[PDB]
């Protein structure tokens with residue numbers, strides 16, 4: 334900036350002076366990433382690799398090829414299968430053969446793959462109007478949020494010499510079991526980020542889960558437990574209300590009352606998102622002693638993540654540095 338408060342607070346530290354080569358020491362920030370499955374945790378991890386470190390080499394991208402294929406195959410199959418549950422016919426009754434062929438093809442391979450035959454089967458289904466009506470009713474079943482991303486780019490992805498772009502790798506969903514740890518440097522802070530006691534927590538919420546039980550209420554219960562937990566008294570709690578892009582589109586056609594029956598505001602982006610923010614922040618029992626730092630995010634949008642992470646780093650610099658060691 335110009336006259337940055339964080340840079341000023343930072344310069345008040347004197348602990349480097351107590352080390353022999355102190356200005357070269359590493360200030361460590363430990364970040365714990367939390368939140369329900371599908372809330373964007375692993376996308377944030379990947380954005381940190383892309384924005385602040387190497388991103389993915391082409392060799393790295395080539396390894397993600399069959400993952401892109403597999404994710405695409407999962408997505409269309411999830412949609413076609415929901416057609417059966419929801420009793421939705423195809424636009425063109427000839428797509429029944431394409432649907433059938435999809436299961437034959439998926440059924441006889443071991444891992445994700447792509448051929449012009451498979452791609453044609455999928456374009457025709459994705460294009461179909463009954464399939465699109467089913468896709469548009471996905472709150473009713475379980476559909477990944479990278480589904481439209483890959484299916485709209487099927488031509489590109491299907492080319493014989495396809496190499497996944499970085500946004501393609503970002504958009505993948507990979508089954509991790511156990512704890513994922515990443516390291517990166519930003520603003521001369523050395524971050525250790527842990528993803529299914531500690532400088533800060535980033536708690537992710539899929540805003541777009543409101544109209545799906547009640548996934549949003551499950552997310553609230555987890556945040557209540559975490560925010561009020563005594564282990565985290567001196568931890569900065571940061572709340573990422575994520576998938577704001579998908580939420581912005583859903584709120585036009587789907588009322589918040591589905592998730593909060595008592596809600597009486599307008600069904601608009603600004604009103605509904607403010608309400609959700611208030612519902613989460615009110616689970617803070619230590620309002621007097623503890624603050625929640627809430628940000629609206631689009632985790633698959635690097636410009637937004639960079640901007641938000643920049644603000645988050647300033648909060649840590651101004652508030653937590655006295656608890657971050659040098660190594």
Ligand SMILES: Nc1nc2c(ncn2[C@@H]2O[C@H](COP(=O)(O)OP(=O)(O)O)[C@@H](O)[C@H]2O)c(=O)[nH]1
Pocket residue numbers: 368369370371372373374375376377477478479503504505506507537575576577578579630631632633634
């Ligand atoms: N449109 C959109 N998609 C997102 C956003 N954040 C995550 N996703 C996608 O939603 C899915 C779940 O995200 P992921 O990081 O794997 O969730 P995790 O289970 O918390 O690690 C993936 O398909 C992501 O590409 C977002 O802000 N907007």
